[PDB]
Amino acid sequence: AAAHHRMRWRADGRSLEKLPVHMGLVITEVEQEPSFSDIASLVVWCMAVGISYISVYDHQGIFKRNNSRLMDEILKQQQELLGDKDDQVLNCHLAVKVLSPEDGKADIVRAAQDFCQLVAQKQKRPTLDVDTLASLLSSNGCPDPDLVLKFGPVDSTLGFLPWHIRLTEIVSLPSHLNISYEDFFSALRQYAACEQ
């Protein structure tokens, strides 16, 4: 009967001038091993307010090497707060992608290897334009992030989806440990006014 909580979060989502269709969370905090509890709450809040796809990124890969531990805690908090698991568990995996450095640059060369082998198969010719590249990457289906959130001291993307971040807004926050919904919401309130 926590349906009022869904009412509260959906109301916050429809209130912003603009909510990101796609959002990324980049965690530069390498001082300690990150806490999945804070990450899971962040993605849980995005879904609640109405953000379709979230991607979580760590340049060392500790999220991709721990998908199960992070997916476990994302589902639990959803059951815990938002409260038929097959469909719920399906919408979560469909919406949250866990990313690492091998998904932006190393993926860019993967598609290049696709065209070139098709060129060697006489099927493809170079005369490869702009939209042919986009549909050729692993973002064939999914759009590009409207907004990325940088958590931690480091002031780079650290190799996070260089092709897709072409027009996206970046918002950096001091840390993700012990993050609060009021903090995360004024980020969206920053992005809502952000010239797009």
Binding site: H59, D155, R166, T168, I170
Partner: protein, 318 residues
């Protein structure tokens, strides 16, 4: 020259690690059109460009890249777009006629973009100048005219399919390095800092490949009002995360190199899986097999890069 305070902090900043390459997104020229019509502001923006170059030259910043024209800026006002062409022709006409003066100090200029979108004379001036100013080794400035990183990498991409279609490379030789060595900035090394003026905070399709690990510096100042302290604050921020970003770059390298080695040793076994051979190592069948694989990709790719230069050098003639 530089101010005493400006020369003071410069010597102090020169203590720690220094950026060898810094790139600038000059934004907010339009916003400074207050009491200015709009091409008067762009003219003032080019002045602070040369002013800022004095600074980096004073600071020993060796290479600098600037975003002069994005292909997206083509949808602007014909009056405003033609207004940028006039200035593009103007300052470039100053690059010529002021030749040899540019030869005294070791400065070379490189226009980076897809040059087929400009009016013929602009292509000529640009190609005229870059051909003349090339082979100068003390200083380097990359000006990005008609550039988007998306267009850039797609061009580097199609140019390596050219290689496979030309029998110079095979798609196995494709790598992050090969792709790295076919962008317009292959003469430059990767930028240490990226600076963007005005309150905006996006990359706008500018060097997305090369600044994946660069320090991002965004400042609320409009670019025409850029000062030496605005530049100094960027190097300050850069030096803070230098140890992190160095280590960050230093571990990506080792991982991609190790991962490339794991994949390379794998396909050598896949062929050894066929043909009935054993991955024993008894008499180094796989060891020589992988050893030869590195060279055949090394020599075949190395030739492709020499061929791509000759290809690119031929266009410089006309």
């Amino acid at each position: 020259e530089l101010s005493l305070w400006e020369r003071f902090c410069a010597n102090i900043i020169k203590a720690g690690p220094m950026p060898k390459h810094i790139a600038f997104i000059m934004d907010g020229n339009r916003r400074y059109a207050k009491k200015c019509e709009r091409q008067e502001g762009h003219s003032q923006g080019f002045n602070k460009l040369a002013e800022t170059l004095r600074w980096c030259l004073n600071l020993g910043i060796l290479e600098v890249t600037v975003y002069a024209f994005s292909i997206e800026n083509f949808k602007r006002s014909k009056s405003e777009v033609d207004g940028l062409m006039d200035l593009a022709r103007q300052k470039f006409s100053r690059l010529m006629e002021e030749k040899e003066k540019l030869q005294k100090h070791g400065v070379c200029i490189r226009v980076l973009g897809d040059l087929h979108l400009l009016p013929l004379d602009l292509q000529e001036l640009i190609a005229q100048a870059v051909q003349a100013t090339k082979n100068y080794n003390k200083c380097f400035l990359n000006v990005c005219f008609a550039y988007t990183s998306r267009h850039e990498i797609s061009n580097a991409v199609r140019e390596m399919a050219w290689g496979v279609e030309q029998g110079l490379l095979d798609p196995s030789d494709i790598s992050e390095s090969l792709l790295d060595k076919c962008l317009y900035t292959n003469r430059s090394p990767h930028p240490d800092i990226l600076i963007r003026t005005s309150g905006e905070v996006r990359l706008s399709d500018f060097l997305l490949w090369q600044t994946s690990h660069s320090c991002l510096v965004f400042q609320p100042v409009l670019w025409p009002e850029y000062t030496f302290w605005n530049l100094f604050e960027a190097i300050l921020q850069f030096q803070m995360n230098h140890s992190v970003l160095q280590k960050a770059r230093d571990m990506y390298a080792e991982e991609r190199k190790r991962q490339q080695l794991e994949r390379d040793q794998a396909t050598v076994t896949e062929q050894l899986l066929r043909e009935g051979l054993q991955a024993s190592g008894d008499a180094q069948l796989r060891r020589t097999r992988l050893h030869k694989l590195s060279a055949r990709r090394e020599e075949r790719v190395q030739g492709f890069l020499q061929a791509l230069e000759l290809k690119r050098a031929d266009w410089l003639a006309r």
